[PDB]
Design a protein around this ligand. Structure first.
Ligand code: HEM
Ligand SMILES: *[C@@H]1O[C@H](CO)[C@@H](O[C@@H]2O[C@H](CO)[C@@H](O)[C@H](O)[C@H]2NC(C)=O)[C@H](O)[C@H]1NC(C)=O
Ligand SMILES: *[C@@H]1O[C@H](CO)[C@@H](O[C@@H]2O[C@H](CO)[C@@H](O)[C@H](O)[C@H]2NC(C)=O)[C@H](O)[C@H]1NC(C)=O
Ligand SMILES: *[C@H]1O[C@H](CO)[C@@H](O)[C@H](O)[C@@H]1O[C@H]1O[C@H](CO)[C@@H](O)[C@H](O)[C@@H]1O
Ligand SMILES: *[C@@H]1O[C@H](CO)[C@@H](O)[C@H](O)[C@H]1NC(C)=O
Ligand SMILES: *[C@H]1O[C@H](CO)[C@@H](O)[C@H](O)[C@@H]1O
Ligand SMILES: *[C@H]1O[C@H](CO)[C@@H](O)[C@H](O)[C@@H]1O
Ligand SMILES: *[C@H]1O[C@H](CO)[C@@H](O)[C@H](O)[C@@H]1O
Ligand SMILES: *[C@H]1O[C@H](CO)[C@@H](O)[C@H](O)[C@@H]1O
Ligand SMILES: *[C@H]1O[C@H](CO)[C@@H](O)[C@H](O)[C@@H]1O
Ligand SMILES: *[C@H]1O[C@H](CO)[C@@H](O)[C@H](O)[C@@H]1O
Ligand SMILES: *[C@H]1O[C@H](CO)[C@@H](O)[C@H](O)[C@@H]1O
Ligand SMILES: *[C@H]1O[C@H](CO)[C@@H](O)[C@H](O)[C@@H]1O
Ligand SMILES: *[C@H]1O[C@H](CO)[C@@H](O)[C@H](O)[C@@H]1O
Ligand SMILES: *[C@H]1O[C@H](CO)[C@@H](O)[C@H](O)[C@@H]1O
Ligand SMILES: *[C@H]1O[C@H](CO)[C@@H](O)[C@H](O)[C@@H]1O
Ligand SMILES: *[C@H]1O[C@H](CO)[C@@H](O)[C@H](O)[C@@H]1O
Ligand SMILES: [Mn+2]
Length: 299
């Protein structure tokens, strides 16, 4: 928001306004990076981004401590080298390359289609990067009619997403990615769980309208009473939430689940790519921005 608006005060005392991405700007498959870039907390054009720029942006504007993104930074630069063919040093070339499929980006996302979802021809691919309202609605409808949801609900959401993707993706494409996805499940509980409840830190409940605002708008839901977690969330909270989602009891089982979908998940670890591998082509679509309605500087 506009610095003088005070909308972030006293949790964020140096806000910047929302500015929609233009057609030449680079955006990510990540709703957090896209929100930071839309506010210029990382470069609005989505290019040439250092580790410290990301660390500071997450810490001072989203209440996300450095420890939370340590592995994510490692993997972002691994993918940058894989896609571009050379070491990116400490200048991530752009945000778009993070949508390199079967890498950091992964199948059965909550709000994006998969790279080969519903393609009739095996060579074809689609936009696995931009926010897709119909996909996100399949996540939201698992918790339809609710204001909040818990770990077991999140487990059901990700199972629904895995079942849909395993059925709809071109045969042989679908690859389960429980470790990375459920770090991101933890990220959701870290950012938009309801800190107004007395037991938030130990038994967090996601506030659904905050989640939907953040994902749909790629900006922060201050108008709904959200503010950055204070103190900033740390990695222990995120991986404990990840664990608890995957440990939660499943009351409703979708068909067509990949083998082992129900049960614990491996620790997420650094990515690696054989130097012989050539990257899949990135989807070229212009960056998504909210248009129903378009957002103003303070939204
Ligand atoms: C350097 C830091 C980060 C990088 C490089 C990064 C990268 C990514 C990538 C490549 C994806 C796509 C995975 C997929 O296919 O869905 C993603 C998704 C996601 N990210 Fe980020 N991430 C970072 C930090 C964060 C943080 C701190 C949060 C929240 C506190 C966050 C929230 C999410 C969520 C919720 C998704 C899942 C979107 C979906 O499934 O539709 N990310 N991130
Ligand atoms: C996306 O952002 C907009 C803008 O903040 C959200 O809310 C609208 O806000 C403007 C005024 O700021 C008005 O059009 C309405 O009061 C809001 N619309 C409503 C309440 O439906 C919009 O709701 C956000 N989208 C999501 C999915 O949260
Ligand atoms: C982000 O960077 C990637 C990697 O450099 C760009 O993808 C390459 O773009 C060139 C065209 O300039 C193509 O020849 C390559 O085939 C692309 N690589 C892949 C793996 O598809 C991408 O265009 C950049 N995106 C933005 C929005 O700047
Ligand atoms: C991205 O750009 C490529 C070169 O134009 C296309 O071959 C791809 O299909 C992809 O096209 C999509 O995005 C472009 C914007 O660059 C639009 O012009 C297309 O209509 C399509 O949505
Ligand atoms: C914002 O400013 C107020 C007033 O000086 C201060 O009390 C508060 O600690 C500041 N918040 C942060 C996160 O620095
Ligand atoms: C989130 O983190 C937990 C704990 O490391 C994993 O078990 C899970 O697979 C996801 O990576
Ligand atoms: C989540 O999981 C990690 C290991 O992946 C732990 O280090 C953390 O304390 C939390 O239990
Ligand atoms: C790890 O931490 C999370 C968040 O505090 C808890 O919900 C979980 O039960 C475990 O203690
Ligand atoms: C969360 O908790 C599970 C089991 O409690 C662990 O296996 C995982 O490493 C993370 O600490
Ligand atoms: C744990 O608990 C649910 C009920 O909440 C059971 O139905 C399920 O089979 C799981 O074992
Ligand atoms: C069991 O509970 C889950 C959520 O934990 C629901 O998704 C399901 O429909 C059943 O009521
Ligand atoms: C219970 O919930 C799962 C996931 O929401 C569904 O796939 C199932 O059919 C039932 O509605
Ligand atoms: C649906 O079915 C699975 C077995 O496929 C159970 O693990 C789950 O708890 C639910 O009963
Ligand atoms: C997948 O298959 C099972 C029965 O095998 C059902 O529970 C579900 O409705 C879907 O048809
Ligand atoms: C079905 O296939 C998977 C392979 O990912 C196993 O993990 C599972 O135990 C079952 O054999
Ligand atoms: C990480 O691991 C891969 C194997 O999957 C190697 O090929 C790569 O060079 C790096 O050591
Ligand atoms: C997005 O842009 C539209 C263009 O008319 C405005 O009406 C709206 O206020 C938002 O800034
Ligand atoms: Mn994905």
């Amino acid at each position: 928001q506009e610095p003088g608006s005070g909308i972030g005060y006293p949790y964020d005392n140096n806000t910047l306004p929302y500015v929609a991405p233009g057609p030449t700007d680079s955006r990510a498959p990540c709703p957090a990076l896209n929100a930071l870039a839309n506010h210029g907390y990382i470069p609005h054009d989505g290019r040439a981004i250092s580790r410290e720029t990301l660390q500071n942006a997450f810490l001072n504007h989203m209440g996300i401590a450095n420890s939370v993104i340590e592995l994510a930074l490692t993997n972002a630069f691994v993918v940058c080298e894989y896609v571009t063919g050379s070491d990116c040093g400490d200048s991530l070339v752009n945000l778009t390359l993070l949508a390199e499929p079967h890498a950091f980006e992964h199948d059965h996302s909550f709000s994006r289609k998969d790279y080969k979802q519903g393609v009739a021809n095996s060579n074809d691919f689609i936009d696995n990067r931009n926010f897709d309202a119909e996909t996100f609605q399949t996540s939201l409808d698992v918790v339809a009619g609710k204001t909040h949801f818990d770990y077991a609900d999140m487990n059901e959401i990700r199972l629904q997403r895995e079942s849909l993707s395993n059925e709809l993706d071109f045969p042989g494409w679908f690859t389960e990615s429980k470790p990375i996805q459920n770090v991101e499940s933890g990220f959701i509980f870290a950012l938009v769980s309801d800190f107004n409840l007395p037991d938030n830190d130990e038994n967090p409940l996601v506030r659904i309208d905050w989640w939907k605002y953040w994902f749909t708008n790629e900006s922060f839901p201050y108008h709904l009473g959200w503010h950055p977690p204070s103190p900033a969330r740390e990695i222990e909270f995120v991986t404990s939430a990840s664990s608890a989602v995957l440990a939660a009891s499943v009351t409703s089982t979708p068909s067509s689940l990949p083998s082992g979908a129900i049960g614990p998940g491996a620790e997420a670890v650094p990515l690696s790519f054989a130097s012989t591998m050539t990257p899949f082509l990135l989807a070229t679509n212009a960056p998504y921005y909210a248009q129903d309605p378009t957002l103003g500087p303070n939204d």
